[PDB]
Amino acid sequence: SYGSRIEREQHHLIESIEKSTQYMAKRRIGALISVARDTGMDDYIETGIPLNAKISSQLLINIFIPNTPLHDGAVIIKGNEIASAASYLPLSDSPFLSKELGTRHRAALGISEVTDSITIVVSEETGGISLTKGGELFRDVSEEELHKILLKELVT
């Protein structure tokens, strides 16, 4: 299993993001998940706590539980692993980002301006799910909309 093993991994990654963000959105647990693609993110992985862990919805949920050792920052997914938790992501300086969106959104926008990553945000204030890519924000997406974007962008 080579190319076909990859697709099973990518679809499991999508499902893992969908299940965990749905769980966290319902409970208004803030989350920040950046999926590396072609642009290396080892610099930002080094700022976090190394996990090098199998991807699962359960582990993603456990990471972001508030006031816990792994929650205070971003999860970065690299290849087929959860590489790090509590990672830094650079804050966008954009004045176009709505002032009602917090640091998670600004950090997701920031990494999206200097990498080709796909970053998913769960708002702890609204439960809304947002995505950043290439300096753009997809704000408060539906489950269907998130699904289509993750399929387009993570299944190659």
Swiss-Prot record:
One of its GO terms (biological process) is cAMP biosynthetic process. GO terms for cellular component: plasma membrane. Keywords: ATP-binding, Cell membrane, Membrane, Nucleotide-binding, Nucleotidyltransferase, Transferase, Transmembrane, Transmembrane helix. It is found in: Cell membrane. Its cofactor is Co(2+). GO terms for molecular function: adenylate cyclase activity; ATP binding; diadenylate cyclase activity. Its main location: membrane. Disruption phenotype: Essential, it cannot be deleted. It is an enzyme of class 2 (transferase). Catalyzes the condensation of 2 ATP molecules into cyclic di-AMP (c-di-AMP). c-di-AMP is a signaling compound secreted into the host's cytosol where it triggers the cytosolic surveillance pathway (CSP), a host pathway of innate immunity characterized by expression of beta interferon (IFN-beta) and coregulated genes. Expression of truncated proteins (missing first 80 or 100 residues) in E.coli leads to c-di-AMP synthesis. This is Diadenylate cyclase. It comes from Listeria monocytogenes serovar 1/2a (strain ATCC BAA-679 / EGD-e). The lineage of its organism: Bacteria, Bacillati, Bacillota, Bacilli, Bacillales. The gene is dacA.
